[PDB]
């Protein structure tokens with residue numbers, strides 16, 4: 001088990017393959033520094049209606065999740081990629097090609113890549 005917001009979440013998830021990541025209680029996306037989607041788990045698709053196989057390779061901020069292109073989300077992502085120590089938590093609403101859904105988001109650098117964790121609120 002691993003809880004959303006755990007202090008060493010990136011350690012636990014570093015040791016995980018697809019099945020384990022797909023088993024998480026919360027949405028988990030891994031992005032590269034350009035915002036391209038490396039991994040996208042089953043729990044996230046249950047929040048957003050996206051097929052996890054279909055969004056791998058796409059750009060999260062440009063194409064998949066346009067509502068996240070804002071100082072409040074994308075702005076914080078690039079600040080944390082630049083500053084080297086991404087680790088930030090905030091509320092957000094996801095509303096593109098889905099019913100508007102309130103979530104909380106935790107972005108954290110991976111053990112060169114970057115996690116976006118999501119849970120319904």
Ligand SMILES: *C(=O)/C=C/c1ccc(O)cc1
Nearest residue numbers: 048065066067094095096
């Ligand atoms: C806003 O358009 C957000 C879209 C979105 C957020 C998270 C996802 O996993 C997919 C789309």
